[PDB]
Amino acid sequence: DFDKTLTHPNGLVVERPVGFDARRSAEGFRFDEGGKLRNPRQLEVQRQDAPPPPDLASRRLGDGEARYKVEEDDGGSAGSEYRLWAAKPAGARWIVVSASEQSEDGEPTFALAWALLERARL
Amino acid sequence: TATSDLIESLISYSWDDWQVTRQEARRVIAAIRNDNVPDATIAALDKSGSLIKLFQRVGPPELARSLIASIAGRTTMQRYQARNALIRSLINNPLGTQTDNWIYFPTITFFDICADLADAAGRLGFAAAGATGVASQAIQGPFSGVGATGVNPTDLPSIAFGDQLKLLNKDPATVTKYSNPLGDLGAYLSQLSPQDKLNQAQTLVGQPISTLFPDAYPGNPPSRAKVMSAAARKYDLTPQLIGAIILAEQRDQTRDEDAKDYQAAVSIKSANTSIGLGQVVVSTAIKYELFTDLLGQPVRRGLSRKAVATLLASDEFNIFATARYIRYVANLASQQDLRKLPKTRGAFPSIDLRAYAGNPRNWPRDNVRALASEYTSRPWDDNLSPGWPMFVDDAYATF
Ligand SMILES: [Ca+2]
Ligand SMILES: [Ca+2]
Ligand SMILES: [Zn+2]
């Protein structure tokens, strides 16, 4: 479910999730789900110098060890808004993934966001 | 009164079996509902000690509901007496009304809810009976929810215990079964003729409300149309806008999602689902007191989260919650700073924030589209739903 490879002037390498629209941002890429959906997924992947906050939740991701956080905001009739923030060590630096979608069925898996982060390197 | 005498008689004797009570109950109920001096009838039965007896021996919850809703609804200056007698009667058989669909309402709460509702309907203009309008026969796919069908979410069979666990585990095929039916919104609209659209609108709006308190009304339940129009008046909206919001939701709704919406909300998890006609989110109804104009504060302070979820499944409550929330989204919009909402500005160039504060009759079409986005999703965060604006706009056009 990934296709095109994408490379940033800052050295970040990721794949464009299939069915998504890619845009370059300050320190990475933004992906917005294709089409005109009621409730599209939005992802961002960025290179980051600054380390994550201490004590974030910890998860095994591929080789292992991402630290993440999930926040829940009031949304609308498609459900609350859920925001993932996740960081993986990238040498002495960090790669960060932010993801958003609504859900009326509790916290989303964010599988695609986790995948993107896993397949990210510099 | 004539009715008190009549009821005094049916009470003149104990009752043999479950069936006698059944027919005698049914008969007292109709007498109450057809009685033209309901206050004086209650006063007469109170004096006799018969009021308490009435409540004590109308046993089966189903019948206690019809009785309690009718009396609470029809009475005014003597209603406190009926409440007093009911309370006294509960001391023995406390079960009262608190079963099945109504398990989250203590019996006295059920009385108070019926009382407030009856009062609000007369005061706000939606007491009048609706015509038996026709409902969709669908059980699957787009527009097979209560909006189309008239089948209350609360009446739907439990989702199999096994599948509930699969939902929790996010098993794709099962999640799909119980979620929004639609992906490509435009593609769905395309398969509809203008006549089909119009027929959905009529079906949606013309049928009686699916209410959990039918006997709180003087006659048959009102049409949804009547309730929406009353709500438009209360919140300075139009029934057409309210209609368009709900029609869009209801096209993106199935019988199965109704079942999920309600059951998950009242499960161990107390899920924060969007429920009923306008797909109001449980937490949103509580946080913004969306029932304020139908229910008095005392009742409102007593409701559990799950009682709130259940109310959202009652059409009038939902419609008023939806309308109140729309007015809230519009007011909040009128207070925004448009230069701080450039994506919104971009997608809806003719948007007029000031106009939002007033009646939709004066909104530019772009206000309707913007509000649509900001109804499915978080309001005025400058992050938009790409597809809902055109989806709602189309329904608006039909109205
Ligand atoms: Ca839905
Ligand atoms: Ca929004
Ligand atoms: Zn829902």
Provide the residue range defining the domain that includes B368. Answer: 1-399
Encoded tokens for B72: 């609470």
Question: Cα torsion for B150, B153, B159, B163, to the nearest 10°?
Answer: 100
A34 touches chain B (CB under 8 A): no
**Binding site feature residues of B for Ca(2+):** 180, 252-253, 257, 374, 377-378, 381, 383
A105–B273 CB contact, under 8 Å: yes
Contact A22, A4 (CB under 8 A): yes
Cα B167 from chain centroid? 26
CA A100 to chain B, closest CA, distance in angstroms equals 11
In chain A, the residue whose alpha carbon lies closest to the alpha carbon of B170 is A109
Q: What is the secondary structure of B122-183 as a DSSP string?
A: HHHT--SPPP--------SSSS-SHHHH---GGGSPPPPHHHHHHHHTT-HHHHHHTS-S-S
Ligand 3 center–CA B18 separation, angstroms: 40
Contact B97, B63 (CB under 8 A): no
B386–A36 CB contact, under 8 Å: yes
Contact B206, B221 (CB under 8 A): no
A98 touches chain B (CB under 8 A): no
Encoded tokens for B191: 């398969």
Contact B368, B243 (CB under 8 A): no
Contact B253, B200 (CB under 8 A): no
CB neighbours of B343 closer than 8 A, spacing ≥ 6? B382, B383, B384
Q: What is the secondary structure of B71-104 as a DSSP string?
A: HHHH-STTHHHHHHHHHHHHTT-TTTT-SGGGTT
Encoded tokens for B281: 């989110």
A105–B180 CB contact, under 8 Å: no
Ligand 1 center–CA B244 separation, angstroms: 14
A77–B274 CB contact, under 8 Å: yes
The response to whether A81 counts as a known ligand-binding position is no
Q: Which of B41, B120, B22, B23 is nearest to B82 (CA)?
A: B41
User: What total number of domains does chain B contain?
Assistant: 1
SS3 annotation, A101-113: EEECCCCCCCHHH
Beta bridge partners of A90: A93
- Return the DSSP state at A121: B
Experimental method: X-ray
Provide the residue range defining the domain that includes A36. Answer: 1-122
Q: Which of B203, B205, B201 is nearest to B225 (CA)?
A: B205
What resolution, expressed in A, was reported for this entry? Answer: 2.4
Beta-carbon-side half-sphere exposure of residue B57 (alpha carbons within 13 Å): 23
> Which of A1, A23, A30, A77 is best to mutate for the B interface (most B CBs within 10 A)?
A77
Find the CATH number of the domain harbouring A37: 2.60.120.1690
Beta bridge partners of A47: A95
Cβ-based burial of B13 (10 A; exposed 0-12, middle 13-18, buried ≥19): exposed
Contact A121, A61 (CB under 8 A): no
SS3 state at A32: strand
Size of interface A-B (CB pairs under 8 A): 91
Beta-carbon-side half-sphere exposure of residue B112 (alpha carbons within 13 Å): 16
User: What total number of domains does chain A contain?
Assistant: 1
Report the C-alpha gap between A89 and A94 in whole angstroms: 5
Which positions 144-203 of B are in contact with A (Cβ < 8 Å)? 167, 170, 175, 179-180, 182-186
Question: Cα torsion for B68, B73, B76, B79, to the nearest 10°?
Answer: 10
Q: Which of A40, A104, A109 sits opposite B281 (nearest CB)?
A: A104
Radius of gyration for the alpha carbons in chain A, expressed in angstroms and rounded:
14
Chain A residues within 8 A of B284 when measuring between CB atoms:
74
Q: Which of B376, B379, B390 sits opposite A78 (nearest CB)?
A: B376
Q: Which amino acid is at B169?
A: N
Encoded tokens for A112: 């695609």
Report the C-alpha gap between A87 and A96 in whole angstroms: 5
CA B17 to chain A, closest CA, distance in angstroms equals 46
